[PDB]
Amino acid sequence: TKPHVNIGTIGHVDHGKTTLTAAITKVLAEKGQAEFKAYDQIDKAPEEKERGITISTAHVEYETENRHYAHVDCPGHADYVKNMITGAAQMDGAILVVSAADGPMPQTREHILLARQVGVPYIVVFLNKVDMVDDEELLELVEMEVRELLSSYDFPGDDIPIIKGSALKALEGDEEGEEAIMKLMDAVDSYIPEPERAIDKPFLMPIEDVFSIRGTVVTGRVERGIVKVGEEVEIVGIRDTQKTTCTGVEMFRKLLDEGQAGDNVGVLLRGTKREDVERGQVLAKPGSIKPHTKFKAEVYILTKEEGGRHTPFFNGYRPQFYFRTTDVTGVITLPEGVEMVMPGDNVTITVELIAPIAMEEGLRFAIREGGRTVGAGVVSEIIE
Ligand SMILES: Nc1nc2c(ncn2[C@@H]2O[C@H](COP(=O)(O)OP(=O)(O)O)[C@@H](O)[C@H]2O)c(=O)[nH]1
Ligand SMILES: [Mg+2]
Numbered sequence: 361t362k363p364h365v366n367i368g369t370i371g372h373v374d375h376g377k378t379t380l381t382a383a384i385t386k387v388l389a390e391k392g393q394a395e396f397k398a399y400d401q402i403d404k405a406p407e408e409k410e411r412g413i414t415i416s417t418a419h420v421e422y423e424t425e426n427r428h429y430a431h432v433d434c435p436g437h438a439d440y441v442k443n444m445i446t447g448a449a450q451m452d453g454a455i456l457v458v459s460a461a462d463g464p465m466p467q468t469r470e471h472i473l474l475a476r477q478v479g480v481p482y483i484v485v486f487l488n489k490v491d492m493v494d495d496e497e498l499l500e501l502v503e504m505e506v507r508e509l510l511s512s513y514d515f516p517g518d519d520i521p522i523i524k525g526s527a528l529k530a531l532e533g534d535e536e537g538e539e540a541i542m543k544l545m546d547a548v549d550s551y552i553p554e555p556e557r558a559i560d561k562p563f564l565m566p567i568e569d570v571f572s573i574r575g576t577v578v579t580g581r582v583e584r585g586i587v588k589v590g591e592e593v594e595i596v597g598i599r600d601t602q603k604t605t606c607t608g609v610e611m612f613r614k615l616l617d618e619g620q621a622g623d624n625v626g627v628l629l630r631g632t633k634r635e636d637v638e639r640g641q642v643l644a645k646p647g648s649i650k651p652h653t654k655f656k657a658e659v660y661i662l663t664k665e666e667g668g669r670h671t672p673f674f675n676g677y678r679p680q681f682y683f684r685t686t687d688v689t690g691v692i693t694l695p696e697g698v699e700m701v702m703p704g705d706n707v708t709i710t711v712e713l714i715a716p717i718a719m720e721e722g723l724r725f726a727i728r729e730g731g732r733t734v735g736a737g738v739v740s741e742i743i744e
Contacts (some may be wrong), residue, residue, distance in 0.1 A: 368432035371457035372465040380527040394422030412667035453552030477658035521547035558621035562648035566684040572634040596718035597651025640686040651716035659737035672700040682726040
């Protein structure tokens with residue numbers, strides 16, 4: 361019944377991300393809309409090893425009167441870099457926690473930057489520890505700096521909701537703290553939009569295999585949107601884009617009239633040659649996506665223990681980039697002042713592939729070396 365939304369607390373270590381998370385569950389639990397999770401339950405988040413990468417993440421759920429939320433909170437900076445780049449925890453919005461006494465700190469800056477690189481749509485701020493600041497004019501100045509920092513990374517710093525409170529007071533049952541928590545959740549309900557359904561997006565299916573029996577059939581999972589018998593589709597990319605019509609959709613022993621987000625199907629293509637279709641291309645609504653060879657991306661480089669490299673790479677490093685279904689070789693260019701990239705670092709890079717790929721901001725990929733994963737990335741900018 362209630363719409364679902366995924367959010368999380370970001371911010372510098374020790375500014376109160378975990379205390380605020382606990383306070384949210386406590387106050388909403390007091391309204392009969394969540395189970396209360398204490399500070400220690402959340403601070404001691406379990407390790408989850410997906411694909412060699414190990415990440416500590418606390419998962420709580422709670423509801424307002426309008427929505428149902430899934431909430432992620434992580435102990436260490438490194439955990440946020442990982443989750444945000446790999447996508448192990450998506451965020452329809454983020455709650456930025458900033459200590460009112462200390463103000464923005466390096467990881468406050470980095471999480472805003474990451475939030476923009478990976479496409480976190482919108483941010484709300486909880487300006488925490490107001491009980492340690494006794495001067496109103498000091499409070500306004502720190503709020504002012506936060507809005508500038510947000511705007512310096514293209515978020516609407518002038519329009520973002522910033523709620524001032526004390527998560528620890530709220531957790532002690534203080535009435536003024538609890539009101540701050542509800543001001544925060546009222547802003548989350550109002551300012552963070554509900555995510556677009558996958559089935560409502562323009563059709564896109566990555567091609568995993570190609571067959572010629574009836575004619576040419578391609579198999580894969582429909583990533584988003586719907587494809588119906590009789591509709592036109594474009595084939596992107598690697599080669600010049602081309603257009604055809606869907607004449608059939610099917611599973612095991614089951615013909616279909618349509619294929620929609622989440623379905624594993626085979627799609628009949630009319631008059632398309634098998635040699636003109638190959639793994640790595642995608643089917644898509646005509647005009648909805650384009651092929652590109654060059655782009656910028658935010659990447660996380662796996663550590664030795666995570667199965668990655670154990671030596672840095674330098675400008676001109678030439679690995680394979682795994683987009684959806686296959687590798688494509690590309691050359692890496694490093695930022696202006698960056699000289700090397702150590703295992704475990706995150707950095708923004710420019711890449712030029714040797715072949716085009718259907719590409720768009722927010723597309724995730726792996727970096728591979730010798731058939732081994734060495735990095736994970738997110739396309740942050742297209743370069744034509
Ligand atoms: N005085 C005060 N201390 C707080 C507040 N919120 C959190 N703290 C303290 O700040 C320290 C770190 O808080 P924590 O939530 O673990 O920060 P995190 O690293 O972002 O998760 C703890 O000792 C908390 O008790 C607050 O509103 N006021
Ligand atoms: Mg914490």
